[PDB]
Amino acid sequence: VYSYTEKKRIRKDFGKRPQVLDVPYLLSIQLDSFQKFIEQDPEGQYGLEAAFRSVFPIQSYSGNSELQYVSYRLGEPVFDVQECQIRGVTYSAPLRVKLRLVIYEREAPEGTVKDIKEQEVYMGEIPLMTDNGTFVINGTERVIVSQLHRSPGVFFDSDKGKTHSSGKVLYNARIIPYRGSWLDFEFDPKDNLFVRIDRRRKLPATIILRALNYTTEQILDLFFEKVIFEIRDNKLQMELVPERLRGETASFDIEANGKVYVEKGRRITARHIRQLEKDDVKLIEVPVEYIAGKVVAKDYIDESTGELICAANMELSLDLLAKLSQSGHKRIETLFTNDLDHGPYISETLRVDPTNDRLSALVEIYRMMRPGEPPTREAAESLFENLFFSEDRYDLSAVGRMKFNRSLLREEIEGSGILSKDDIIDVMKKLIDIRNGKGEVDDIDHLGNRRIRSVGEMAENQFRVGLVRVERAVKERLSLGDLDTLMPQDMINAKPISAAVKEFFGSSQLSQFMDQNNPLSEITHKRRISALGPGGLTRERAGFEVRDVHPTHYGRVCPIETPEGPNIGLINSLSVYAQTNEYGFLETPYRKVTDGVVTDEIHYLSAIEEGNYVIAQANSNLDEEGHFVEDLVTCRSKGESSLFSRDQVDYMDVSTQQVVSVGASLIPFLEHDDANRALMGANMQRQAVPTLRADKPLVGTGMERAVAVDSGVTAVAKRGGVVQYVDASRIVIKVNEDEMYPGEAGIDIYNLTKYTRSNQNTCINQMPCVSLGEPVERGDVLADGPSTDLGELALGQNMRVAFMPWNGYNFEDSILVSERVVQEDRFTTIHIQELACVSRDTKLGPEEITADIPNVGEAALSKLDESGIVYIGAEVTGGDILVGKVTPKVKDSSLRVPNGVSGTVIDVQVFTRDGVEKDKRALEIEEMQLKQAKKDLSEELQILEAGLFSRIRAVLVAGGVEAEKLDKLPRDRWLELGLTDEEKQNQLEQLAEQYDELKHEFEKKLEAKRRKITQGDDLAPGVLKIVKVYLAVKRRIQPGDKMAGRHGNKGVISKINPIEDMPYDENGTPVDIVLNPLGVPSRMNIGQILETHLGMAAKGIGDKINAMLKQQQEVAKLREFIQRAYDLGADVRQKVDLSTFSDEEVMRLAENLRKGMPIATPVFDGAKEAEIKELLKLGDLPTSGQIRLYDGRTGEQFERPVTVGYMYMLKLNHLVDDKMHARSTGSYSLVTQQPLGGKAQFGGQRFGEMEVWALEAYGAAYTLQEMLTVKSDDVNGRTKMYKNIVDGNHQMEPGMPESFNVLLKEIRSLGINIELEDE
Amino acid sequence: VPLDGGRFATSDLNDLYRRVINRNNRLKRLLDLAAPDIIVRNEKRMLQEAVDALLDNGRRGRAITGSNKRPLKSLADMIKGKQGRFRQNLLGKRVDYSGRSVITVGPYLRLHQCGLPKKMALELFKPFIYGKLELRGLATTIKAAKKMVEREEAVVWDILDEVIREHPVLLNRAPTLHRLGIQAFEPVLIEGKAIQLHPLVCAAYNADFDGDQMAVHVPLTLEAQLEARALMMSTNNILSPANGEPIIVPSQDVVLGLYYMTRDCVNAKGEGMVLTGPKEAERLYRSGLASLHARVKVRITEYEKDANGELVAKTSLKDTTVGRAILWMIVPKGLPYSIVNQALGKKAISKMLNTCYRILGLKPTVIFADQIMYTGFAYAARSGASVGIDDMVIPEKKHEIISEAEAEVAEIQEQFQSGLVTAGERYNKVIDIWAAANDRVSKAMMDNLQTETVINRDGQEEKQVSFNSIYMMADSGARGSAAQIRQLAGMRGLMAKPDGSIIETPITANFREGLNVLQYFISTHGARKGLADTALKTANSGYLTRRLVDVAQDLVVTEDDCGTHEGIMMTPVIEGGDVKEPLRDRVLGRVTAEDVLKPGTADILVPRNTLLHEQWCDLLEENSVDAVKVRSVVSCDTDFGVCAHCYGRDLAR
RNA sequence: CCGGACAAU
DNA sequence: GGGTTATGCGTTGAATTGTCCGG
DNA sequence: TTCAACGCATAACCC
Ligand SMILES: [Mg+2]
Ligand SMILES: [Zn+2]
């Protein structure tokens, strides 16, 4: 049992490892990103509410006028989502915000004469999501690529190596707030540490702490040990500690129990650890000279003489010791400077700073930001509460606040958005600890050290910046303004906000122009993840490290997708099972196992959990509810295939499909061919264009249905059920009344899509594959779109192959194609072009639109109307005029058809502003446009009325019914019967009243369909009219075509060969294409021969069913052979049995199998070579599957048999047109006769540098005064060649260049003179 | 350029000058109101940066701008640099007189003609049509002459075809690696819509045959032909400048055609039975009676020009294969038949034509070598090439090898945890044993891949040269390297780990059976680095090439003899193993400095200042003299240049 | 006329 | 007081194609 | 608003 489309055509799937869950949808990064961007989400959490949280307080000055925020909502825009794109306007829903404004009276913080309640103030409009999750800016919808950037906060990297030619090991601590100023710290080769700002000049860090309302003692008392000494009459006894003698060699006598254990000149070892900690006597006979071996902490006043003994952080000396020993001061704490216990780094940076006080500690910060200004307390502090303690310039989100908590091993989660003293000291302590003996560094390439940003936050940021730039506006206009006698509409306007919000989405690095040529390219573009943009990774700045990615990304990112050329590894995506958290860090699911019992529960795990925890393997031998019968299972903890035991694993990989998402997952057996030598074919589907006719693949993987319904090109039954009627414009579907509502049940709407031209001349078309009377269900495809058939996916098509280089024509990569395609014309699509005819009112005679156009022919009047517009369906050639347009002086300045791009006029589109008189043709065009609307709504109205007839008569018969009021009664008066008053009667009344309401509900949009359609559009002032023509050119197969399949068959066509020269075989089957088995070592491409036999297997089955049904054997053969042909495989996870179904399902499904049996083979969990041979043996095919071939020229056998079979080939975009060009001579630049650039409109062509000097190196000296002198510079020599070649003489004397002498003219203004002499 | 309206858009050179003149107006106006020393001090600063702004910025502070955050375009931006006029007008400009079409193989042109299609050959030579209409009188005015060309009824192309043979054009390839990319091919007017190139020349440029770029160049004067007969063509420039190997490298599809041809069987079809005619043996070959590897002897006539060009009238009947005689009857005059008896691979065939130039000559040898592709096309048509699974044979001892390999790991790790060994040297031991643990499988697949094809022998079995399909091109050198064949059956080896050093866990299986995601990820992880680094090494190579090409260009030869009888000391440098380079590639065509004497008996070998081309060096190599004294380029008495004797002959000339 | 972005060898 | 070395900043970074929009 | 490689240049700095 399967779905109706699946039961209609069910594809065989293979596999030995059953899966538990299906494939979710991949469009979760735009719809979900924007829905949270615009919602009622108080406290912000990255939403418009977050924008309002910064403009919610608004305390004005001199009056305390409060402008509070209440709510915002967006209604239906003035323009829909299907006609605004056609008109060419900006799509924007009304961003209306309910703002309450209480302008308090002056001086009084409290008091208002009368409160003014602004109902939905108009600050502008923001784009919405039309039908797919994209933005619409200027006609064509715009897709902003999600940007990759680093995580907001502090990083710890090594960045060793180049250390000013010293080689001393160094580290750095780079901080990055959410959107504020960067505090990036680093180390010095001279064993120092300081602070920096925004990658700018260094700032002293041992003076700013004292500047922040601190003093000296809080500096020196928190970075060193304290060791109290004893001042007596002699030798200055002193009190030591094992926490000081742990690494400090006690070079003095240490007595314990009347004997010295550690004396001078010996190192304390483990035995001395016992000899010392077992005694730990404090009253030891320390000598006087060891007292000088310390460094004082602070100043001490001599208790005997009052003399300044020492100031701070200075080494004691024997004279100093005798200068304080003459007292009774038994409290002398000292520091502890070491080289391996404590960092000797803040020992000298204090002396490095010129001062450290209250006043001179601020002139440094005053002069670093505002030179030539006297220092001031308030101005100096303003920066401290601007770049460190602020809410509008420097602030961090919850992400930035909690990242530091984890980075510094904290416990709290939510705090403020500002830096704290504790954090800025701990970064100066754990960081100095990193050097000495502990610590670790974090790599930027790590997934947890980077942040992904999308449209949902970039738009919120833009709108919040927009609100903060207008916040102070009300404060300043209300500082000297009225007394609340206004309305909050004037000072807070819409033009600047709406223009900035709109431009910020269209003119940006991430605002990449959409390239609609493949629905798979549509999804690939939407899931494209890029690094460039505002605050990202630039292409010029790239080392060998940023180019290499952190290997811990398997199961989280698709590796097989990779850009080539200027950028490598810069374009990323999202895996199927894994997803990006709101934190931007990646995580992937795993199956929750226990020590012995495998549970089907799924948890989400990430790299940080993976580092410490051990994950088992997917393809692990399993039996009942789950037990690893094997003991030593290949596990992993840090990406290494660790071989660990069985009873510690609680998770393996969910499935092998979590690594690849969209790159090349449709190609089975990706292990045979490396992605390194397969990405040249795996990267060409992003530009491939669908053809006219496409066949189902014989071999795939099985994930084609989810990706097909994922793309927005199909018509899924969002509300399936009973299928009533299928139309070429709208599939008339509805469900029984039981599942919809008594009030306006309605019918299921499915409008059919017609041919259009989106971005890349792409003609999309949908065809209703369903029949008349075939029931469907929820989530069932109804109308097949491009490259789809019977609800499935088919991009390309299948054709047989041979492996035989004939006469060496396939020299490197060329291919040989016979005349089997050029006569059929099937491998081509339709491209619709567009040329814009500007009706600009030129000076001294505007541009008029009329048929009276000079220098035309008698054929023009037949194809042109009386207004100069070509007839609808009148073909044009090279040189015709689409719309007559002349400039009286008179010359024909209308549009001409260039030679080589001639097509057929199918659509002529005229855009004219309201006020300009139109021609009869155009008037008739909207005239027909309006009347088609009336009839097209009328049939919908009638079918809705008839459906409500079925619903109401159905409830009528169900219960009370009268024979007289049964069929002859009017179909409207269906609310007056003998039914008693109950839930049936009131429901019937509800149905009737809804029927009456819906019988007139349509008239509102009926009326709306004039005042928006009859009115003219608006494009730009200063032009009379803009008219466009959507000409379409159809091309055929011509010399110069290109071949590029899914396998990577990158080759250009060589020439044409006859079908007779095409080699036949023992029965003469015409082989479609023949490859060149020559580049196997250069291009390691082996994994195709084994899968080649699947094409023979499918054709063999299809032809056997065809022959077996041709004579129509009894059901004892039809249902027997169907059984055998559908029962196959050694261990498959799909059980299909058509014979056990009804006989009709047997024939109605066997009829779908005339050419082959679809096969779904996953790379790992699918059909293997053994399946290949068993299926070849299922029909009448040889075990080896090798077929001998005959010769078409001499008619013989060469030496060997040739493998022949069908693969699935697909078409690319570039054929000959993007490269074809031809030009001889004509117009050139204006400053000279230099040809223009590019080959598209008009210009010159490329040439290399080596031939430039190769010709000079040759003996021929005339090769230089021919190519760039009398070809591109000599204006009159050009006229000389024009005048004399047409006579016949072929000799031009070179004149003078007009490029070398031009440069000297502007330097002559600098005082340069030139002279001419001949020796 | 104007804008969308009645106004006009400004330029970079004027945007800032607008503001500096507007501010200068008010600064000068305030001067009449007795301005203090402050206004006069400040007004000079603005003119100082305005004048620096026009000249050049980005030296002091942040450069000013008037358009966006991007810096303004100064006067010294379009003159110098990558985008400057110096590298944009003469070094990558937009050239003219050329058309674009798709390249096909088209193995029809040989050296002289080309495959220029009809439309491409009609849409270019515009003025020559009007130049030739008036000769027969079809047109008397250019105005009316114009409106009989654009329609192309029957007379546009016949007139333009006869001016083709009287004026050859030049064709060059944009993706050119060598220096001799300029070859003279006469235009043709043939049907089709593509351009064909010589398959050897197409691979000669070493460019991907996937929609490359062509460029056509025509001489523009009469005197561009009288001198254009010896310089810009491949007829005389066969020798490559870089090396003694000429530009004509044997093709991969002809080398196999001769390597498998020279293969000798001991018992097959046509074995033993010998005919009495090379042509009748050839007929029995493609009639289905004689094999390409076969032992048949026929009356083959050999000739030698050891005389004064006189044919040595002789013949021979030796046991040859059937196609060697076919090649021999292509020799027009005659060469010592012993010269064609070899494996006929890369180097053997390369020095076939290399010595053929010096034996038979240049002009006939050109044709004799250009027909190699033609005569190998018969082989390509009759055999071709194919690959399949049956060529894969797993080694029989590989599974035992991999079974026994991991045993030592555990046997030493248990000693590590038992306190016998330390991971410091144990890790190095492990990565060293696994650095060679692939070699046993690598030579175990020799005896499982290249030793299979046997033949019968009078009733018994004889083993001879293997007939493995992938080994045909492997041993013949056509395609398939040692570093690639291991990737097929053997182990690809141990690549660099993400840490940077060698991986600790090698590759277990090959790409022919199942492979896990983790290790396939590791292999791709090691693999992308070469593709990443090729984007940068090529650019770095271009940097040095440009730094070394525009510096040595200024050289002129102004003297013939420098008047110096000295030079340098020539002796094959050798250190360590064997010497790789002889004197042959050192001195070849150079005027000797003085008379070299024989070391043994003091015999004058070269009498005076003479060249050293073929036989002089053959005298040196047979007399074993290492006292060569030739004029050296560094030691030359030539004013601004070097004389011809210090350099002598040059390659490609 | 100058850039951004995607894609191609 | 001659010579060595710490430290700031000068220059540059492949062949241009194809096509889209935006001032 | 994160370069790397190469290299002449002042201003200090070592006994
Ligand atoms: Mg190419
Ligand atoms: Zn000389």
Numbering used by the authors:
A (entry chain C): 2 to 890, 913 to 1342
B (entry chain D): 253 to 905
Verbatim from the authors:
Transcription and translation are central gene expression processes subjected to extensive regulation. In bacteria, the absence of a nuclear-cytoplasmic barrier means that ribosomes can translate RNAs as they emerge from RNAPs in a process known as coupling. Significantly, we find that the ribosome increases the speed of transcription at the expense of decreased fidelity by exerting mechanical force on the RNAP and by allosterically inducing an active anti-swiveled conformation of the enzyme. Our work shows that the coupling of translation to transcription prevents prolonged stalling of RNAP at the expense of transcription fidelity through a combination of force and allostery in vitro.
To establish whether the ribosome allosterically affects RNAP, we used cryo-EM to determine the structure of the RNAP harboring a terminal rU-dG mismatch at ES56 in the absence (RNAPFree) or presence (RNAPTTC) of a coupled ribosome. In the RNAPTTC active site, 9 RNA bases are paired with the template DNA up to the i site, leaving the i+1 site empty. While it is not possible to assign the ribonucleotide identities in this structure, but given that we had incorporated three terminal phosphorothioate modifications in the RNA to prevent their hydrolysis, we conclude that RNAPTTC is in a post-translocated state in which the rU-dG mismatch is tolerated in comparison with the RNAPFree, in which the polymerase is backtracked. We propose that the anti-swiveled RNAPTTC corresponds to an active polymerase since it can overcome and progress through mismatch-induced pausing. Our active anti-swiveled RNAPTTC state should allow for TL folding, which is hindered in the swiveled, backtracked RNAPFree. The map, however, lacks the resolution to assign base identities of the RNA-DNA hybrid within the RNAPTTC to confirm that the terminal mismatch was indeed tolerated and retained as opposed to being removed.
